Amino acid sequence: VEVLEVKTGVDSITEVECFLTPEMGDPDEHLRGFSKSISISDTFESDSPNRDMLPCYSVARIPLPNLNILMWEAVTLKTEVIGVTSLMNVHSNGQATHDNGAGKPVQGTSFHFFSVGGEALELQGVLFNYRTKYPDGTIFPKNATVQSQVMNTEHKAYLDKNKAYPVECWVPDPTRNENTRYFGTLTGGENVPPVLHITNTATTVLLDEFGVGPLCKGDNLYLSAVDVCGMFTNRSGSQQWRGLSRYFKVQLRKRRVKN
Amino acid sequence: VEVLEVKTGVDSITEVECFLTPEMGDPDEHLRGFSKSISISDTFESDSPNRDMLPCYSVARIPLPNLNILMWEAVTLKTEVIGVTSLMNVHSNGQATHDNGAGKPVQGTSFHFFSVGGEALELQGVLFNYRTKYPDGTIFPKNATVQSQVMNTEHKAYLDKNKAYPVECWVPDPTRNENTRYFGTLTGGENVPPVLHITNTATTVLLDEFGVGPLCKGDNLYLSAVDVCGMFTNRSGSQQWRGLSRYFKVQLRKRRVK
Amino acid sequence: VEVLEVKTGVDSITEVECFLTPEMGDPDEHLRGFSKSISISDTFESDSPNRDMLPCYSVARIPLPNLNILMWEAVTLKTEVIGVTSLMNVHSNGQATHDNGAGKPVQGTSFHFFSVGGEALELQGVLFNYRTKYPDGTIFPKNATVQSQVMNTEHKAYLDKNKAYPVECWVPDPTRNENTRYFGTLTGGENVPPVLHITNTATTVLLDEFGVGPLCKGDNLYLSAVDVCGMFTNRSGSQQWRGLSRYFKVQLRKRRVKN
Amino acid sequence: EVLEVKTGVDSITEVECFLTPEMGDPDEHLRGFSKSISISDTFESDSPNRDMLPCYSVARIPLPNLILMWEAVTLKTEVIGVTSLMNVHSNGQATHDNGAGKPVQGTSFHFFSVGGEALELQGVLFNYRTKYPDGTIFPKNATVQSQVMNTEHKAYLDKNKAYPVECWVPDPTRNENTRYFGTLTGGENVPPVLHITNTATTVLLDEFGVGPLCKGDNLYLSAVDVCGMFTNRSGSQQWRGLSRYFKVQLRKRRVKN
Amino acid sequence: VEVLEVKTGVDSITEVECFLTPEMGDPDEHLRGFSKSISISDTFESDSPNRDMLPCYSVARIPLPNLILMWEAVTLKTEVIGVTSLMNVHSNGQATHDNGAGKPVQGTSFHFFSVGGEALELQGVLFNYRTKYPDGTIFPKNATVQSQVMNTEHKAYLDKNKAYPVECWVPDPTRNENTRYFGTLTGGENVPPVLHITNTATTVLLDEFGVGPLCKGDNLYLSAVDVCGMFTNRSGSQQWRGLSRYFKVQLRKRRVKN
């Protein structure tokens, strides 16, 4: 497709604003935003995580004003994690730091990820352990082999459904995603402190080196996120993933395209 | 409101300078700056923190010289935490690092936050545990549901009162706050070290991408802050939040609007 | 060689895109991407690591479109580690963080390295302990002496074979590698947390101060990588290196040279 | 009113010096160290001895006699003797059985300022009931509000070995004629991270291009470099401090009224 | 001396490339790159480290092409050589935990390099002035208690290899006009080595007037310390481990008056 001129004027511009809720597993009616407590398999062969123990990628497909050639072009993003201060609840059934101490805060491995695209985020499967049996209700790499532990090119998918694609199975496919801008950080380690910044003064530019942002096919914008903040440790010592919602504000402009 | 030209001349500028004290809970007459010692509930459902155990957002509404259309526009900010060196008192009823050692310093989860606006900071409620029973004298998310643990759009508030809005319940609402600039960092983790920088040489510009700063409605400037530095651990092992004051210096100019 | 003008026009550019799989040791048919469990010799004298306990440098030689004097010049690189989220599998035969806790994540010493060159990466040998007996099937510093522990200029090699050059024996030779650009970070320490960033928005420019990138001799591009992410600790406490694949995308252009 | 800069060869001068730390110096052998830290039983009974309390360092440096005033334009600065912290073999508590001595580590405060007059201080107390010892200058008439902000506690850094670090900070409402920079890194296990180089310069000019102006032809340099604590074999801990190098370039500036 | 124009032309430029080996103590014929295991004295007064327990500064003086013209050092590429050797976690190390891999090299590090047209000038500072430094080392003489903070008598030149202990000496900031130095001490018993390698990074050696070190007598002085941390053996005893440093220096001919 040939990318031509940007439309100017009052109605040449639109704005998308929303939040994506985390999908941590939600083990019961009181635990939205948490996973089930983590259990450990005896062997690699017997790894069989339940669905409510697996955080999943979040995704929203957002319909844009009909243009039917013109396409909406995503230009700028403002984003942040919503509710960062909730992690200061150090008094709610947590394991004490020491005798008489406060509760341990959420900490340990985190994955913070967001993307803005003109089509679904394209995924590549990579498995820590190829013999893991993934549960019904999840979408996971099929026909896994030992090579799936490093790179098996069969594991291609689209992030096209909520509560479905487990975080541990899937990453953005760097061989694809031409029409998406993605950003992520895994911070591993059992004792890693959450470091969460909030401000309404920071913008991310979504244009590539040619001045072109994601172009929204069929007038749909795709927003994806993961914000696993770390693990909450309850009084018994059991640990659950804790996630938070992510705010998105995307500025878009009309762009003429040919063919 | 349409934003027009900035007024010039000697009388077209003003300066606001002040300290905002922390509101950590102040459990007795000797413990200003501290919270009550932290207790842990045995279940999520029984979480019922006492008021003096909950740090709150600080806020000051500052009257500006009367203009009564001209509005005061906040342009720059100098800010820092005041009393950073007090955290070196490692000899005062603290739990020793090890046998014969010095007292443990203030450490662990911190939240450092400041905002400057031409109206009250707008808040969105998010709850770690939606069944937490928040105490009388605090203002908290009402009609909480399990969805409040991730996002419930009913929980909207204004930071319009001191010693009232618990830090753990509320964040700046990213869907609002057009007329405020806010900045915050949460550093979690039980053993996290305070890293506190001071200088009189650093300035934050409050103008947006169109060159407009917060515009002060009714000639009032709103300053908000949280500076939970971490926890102090006493000899028994009990832990209390410790907070410090924040200095604000704001430069403002007169701006015509229509 | 005298470097002259760059060729222009649509056909003057080409792109290489591939992944390099990690070579961590692969101790059995199920453990691709892992090393063998780490054992410790009683003395420096008795240090004799298994082949499957030693991570190696990865390399790929990529043939480019035939030119002939013109040479392909590597200008830009996009690169990232593939499968960062796999390290969130904290439920598979791991040692618990504490009683009832989740499994320990991959952590500890890491080496992340990549290079792009117009010829094989040039290596210099440096040994932690010169008395280490390196195993059959590996290529290692020969005629080692006590000076090999700091600098022995005899230890020169080319990274010209996979599953061969152990990471711990070899580094890029800074006295050579004129025609390669290399980047690496060793983060040492038992409890170091992996910090892995992913994005499709970041480019590294490969041109030197004179504006000249690697020039591909015989129309071959050389890509090299190491991504030792840390160690996985199983239920017994034994530890194995865990590695991940690395994506490369290289933009090249035709450059005229003389002699 | 601040007018033009004087040019020519003698319109420029340089000040170079070392500021020694004032950590408490508990005996004739322990310069640079505090007394071992003792912990009070309660807040009420907190009564630190003088030699256990690090203080701010200050030097007033006379400039060439000169309305013209010397204007401080640039600063080069670093901690001197960073490598001494590698003495891990001198009466230290072992890291573990048969291990080396523990290095200096834990809470640090690194601070420096350059001004045309004494650094202005604001008092803030961790515990308002702390009894500060004779020989120190501390916040007077302390109340519970002193634990957060009591504006009565104003002072000038005008004496060495006198103003305890834990009691005092630069007063942000004042210090118009000073540039100050500091970092507190708290936490019992914090590692010292100390950079040295003769290639780094700090510009002291404000946004209007004016540096500190030296009243009475005197330049004020202040510092704190508490590097952390040294743990001896018994487990007792003392603050260890190091000297700070200052190189300040000054130029002659004409001023009115 | 007044600094004039840079000479141009093909032969007006030269390059120096070399490696400086670390001098960690080398306690026996198998332990080049290591110090002797660290022993701890009972008291400050009894501190008496053996020579092979003390890492020293490394120095090389490199002769340049014979030339008033002076060679001027303009740029530096440098890195630590053999960073991957620290991945040997299988050779007589102390296990991190039961059944685990050996502990890697970690704890206090000092990484330092300088480039000058004359010997690096040193200032002495002692952790403990009563330390008895061993024969074969060059150390601050006539030490007093003031040597623990600043004794201006302690002046030296880094003019000998395996001689000047790292812990005794630092670059003298009141001198070194004709040298550019850079160093980082990262203390702490468990500090992780973070070691970056690349052939794409250059340090410019010119001062604010655009003048680099000028090589007196046509000699270039390179100095380094790369104590990477401590290696812990099975018994728990710890030894410093160091690595070599690569230097590549570009120089140009500069005319100088008198």
Phi and psi of A12, rounded to 5°?
A: -80, 0
Q: What is the DSSP letter of D213?
A: B
Q: How many angstroms separate the Cα of B144 from the Cα of each of A34, A89, B149, B161?
A: 17, 16, 9, 21
Coil vs helix vs strand at D105: strand
Residue B113 in tokens:
């936050």
Instruction: Look up residue E49 and give its amino acid.
Output: P
**Residues in CB range of C34: below 8 A, 6 or more apart:** A149, C24, C25, C26, C27, C232, C240, C241, C242, C243
Burial (CB < 10 A; 0-12, 13-18, 19+), residue E62, is middle
Decide if D124 and B245 are in contact by the 8 Å CB cutoff: yes
- Total CB pairs under 8 A between chain C and E: 182
Alpha-carbon torsion angle A122, A127, A130, A132, nearest 10? -100
- For the beta carbon of residue E86, count every other beta carbon within 10 angstroms: 26
Q: Helices (H) and strands (E) in chain C — how many of each?
A: 0, 14
Phi, psi of C4 (to 5 degrees): -110, -145
d(CA B12, CA B253): 6
Kindly identify which residue of chain D lies nearest to residue E125, measuring between CA atoms. D81
C-alpha C16, offset from chain centre: 18
Q: Which residues pair with D156 in a beta bridge?
A: D120
**Residue D151 near chain E (CB below 8 Å):** no
Name residues whose C-beta falls within 8 Å of residue C215's C-beta, 6 or more positions apart in sequence.
C1, C3, C71, C72, C73, C118, C179, C255, C257
Please, which chains are in contact with E (at least 3 CB pairs closer than 8 A)? C, D
Q: How far apart are CA B57 and CA B78, in angstroms?
A: 19
Separation of alpha carbons C179 and E199, rounded Å: 10
Taking contacts as CB-CB distances below 8 angstroms, the residues of chain D near E146 are: 31
Contact yes or no for E99/E225 (Cβ under 8 A): no
DSSP chain E: -EEEEEP-SGGGEEEEEEEE--BS---STT-TTBPPPP--BSSSTT----GGGS-B-EEEEEE-----EEEEEEEEEEEEE-GGGGG--SBSBPBSSTT-PBPPSBS-EEEEEEEESSPPEEEE--S-TT--PPTTS---SS--GGGGT--TT-EEE--STTTSBGGGEEE-TTS-TTEEEEEEEE--TTPPPEEEEESS--EE---TTS---B-GGGEEEEEEEEEEEEEEBTTS-EEEEE-EEEEEEEEEEEEEE-
3-state class (DSSP) for residue D76? strand
CA–CA separation, A242 vs A227, rounded Å? 9
| Distance in angstroms (rounded) separating the CA atoms of residues B24 and B163 | 8
**E contacts of C177 (beta carbons < 8 Å):** 199
By C-alpha distance, the chain B residue nearest D42 is B93
List, in sequence order, the alpha helices (H) in chain B. Answer: none
Neighbours of D160 (CB within 10 A): 15
Q: Where are the alpha helices (DSSP H) in D79-127?
A: none
Select from E69, E170, E163, E66 the least CA-distant residue to E114.
E170
Two tokens at E3? 């600094």
Q: How far is CA C157 from CA A227, C57, C60, C176, C222, in A?
A: 45, 12, 16, 11, 15
Given a contact cutoff of 8 angstroms between Cβ atoms, the answer to whether C189 and C110 are in contact is no
CA distance D88 to B32: 41
CA dist., res. E20 & res. E32, Å (int): 13
Contact D29 E237 (CB under 8 A): no
C-alpha B64/C-alpha B12 separation (Å) is 12
Query: Distance of CA C20 to CAs C72, C203, C242, Å?
Result: 21, 18, 15
CA-CA distance, C174 to E78, in Å (whole number)? 9
The CATH number linked to A122 is 2.60.175.10
B237 touches chain A (CB under 8 A): yes
DSSP β-ladder status, D237-241 and C122-125: unpaired
Which helix (H) or strand (E) segment is B246 a member of? Answer: strand B245-257
How deeply is E256 buried, as exposed, middle or buried, from its count of CB atoms within 10 A (0-12, 13-18, 19+)?
Answer: middle
Give phi and psi for A240, each to the nearest 5: -130, 145
CA-angle at D26, arms to D20 and D32, nearest 5°: 25
Which residues in chain B have Cβ-Cβ distances shorter than 8 Å to A16?
none
Compute φ and ψ for B171, nearest 5 degrees: -130, 160
Residue A63 pairs in a beta bridge with A220
Interface test with C, best of A34, A132, A151 (most C CBs within 10 A): A151
Cβ atoms within 10 A of the Cβ of C10, count?
5
Range of the domain at A240: 1-259
* CB within 8 Å: C47 and E197: no
Range E8-18 burial, b when 16+ CB lie within 10 A, else e? eeeeeeeebee
User: Are the Cβ atoms of C200 and A177 closer than 8 angstroms?
Assistant: yes
How far apart CA D146 and CA D126 sit, in angstroms, is 8
Closest by CA position to C201, among listed A181, D117, B252: A181
Rounded CA gap, A54 and A39, in Å? 11
The residue behind tokens 């002076």 is: E70
Q: Which residue among D179, D186, D206 places its CB closest to the CB of B193? A: D186
Q: Are the beta carbons of C237 and E100 separated by less than 8 Å? A: yes
Q: Is chain A in touch with chain C: ≥3 Cβ pairs within 8 A? A: yes
Burial environment of residue B200 by CB neighbours within 10 A (0 to 12, 13 to 18, 19 or more): buried
Residue reference for tokens 């063919």:
A259
Nearest to A41 by CA among A125, A111, A128: A128
Most E CBs within 10 Å, among D80, D84, D246, to test the E interface:
D84
Give backbone dihedrals phi and psi of A174, rounded to 5 degrees, phi first: -70, -15
Looking at the complex, report in whole angstroms how far the Cα of residue E151 sits from the nearest Cα belonging to chain D: 10
CA pair distance B247, D171, nearest whole angstrom: 10
Amino acid at B10: V
Tell which phi-psi region holds residue C230, choosing left (phi > 0), alpha (psi between -120 and 50) or beta.
Answer: left
Helix ranges, chain D (H)? none
The H or E element containing residue A81 is strand A70-82
C204 at A interface, C-beta within 8 A: no
Picking from B179, B197, B213, B192, the residue whose alpha carbon sits closest to that of residue B247 is B197
| Among candidate residues A240, D108, A77, A110, the one with its CA nearest the CA of residue B186 | A110
Structure tokens at B36: 């009550």
User: Residues C171, E81: contact at Cβ < 8 Å?
Assistant: yes
Which D residues, 152 through 171, put their C-beta within 8 Å of a C-beta on chain E?
none
Question: In which region does residue B33 sit, left (phi positive, over 0), alpha (psi from -120 to 50) or beta (all else)?
Answer: left
**Residue A77 burial by Cβ neighbours in a 10 Å radius (0-12, 13-18, 19+):** buried
Query: Is A93 part of the contact surface with chain B (CB cutoff 8 Å)?
Result: yes
CA separation for the pair D161, D54 (Å, rounded): 8
Task: Give the integer Cα–Cα distance in Å for A30 and E44.
Answer: 61
C-alpha distances in angstroms, B45 versus B48, B53, B168, B186, E189? 9, 18, 17, 26, 43
Residues 183-202 of B with CB under 8 A from D: 191-201
- Give the Cα separation of D148 and D139 in Å (integer): 13
Q: How far apart are CA D170 and CA D117, in angstroms?
A: 13
Distances (CA, A) of C114 to C58, C138, C147: 9, 21, 28
Chains touching chain C at 3 or more Cβ pairs under 8 angstroms?
A: A, E
- The beta-carbon contacts of A135-144 under 8 Å, at least 24 apart in sequence, are A135/A48, A135/A49, A135/A50, A135/A51, A135/A54, A136/A51, A137/A51, A137/A163, A137/A164, A138/A51, A138/A54, A138/A56, A138/A164, A138/A165, A138/A166, A138/A169, A139/A164, A139/A165, A140/A165, A140/A166, A140/A169, A141/A169, A141/A170
> What is the total count of domains within chain A?
1
Please answer whether residues E179 and E115 qualify as being in contact, where contact means their C-beta atoms are separated by less than 8 angstroms.
yes
Q: Which residues of E fall within a CB distance of 8 Å from D20?
A: 149-150
Token pair in block for residue E230: 């401590």
Inter-chain CB proximity B92 and D39 less than 8 Å: yes
Structural tokens at position C59? 């390399």
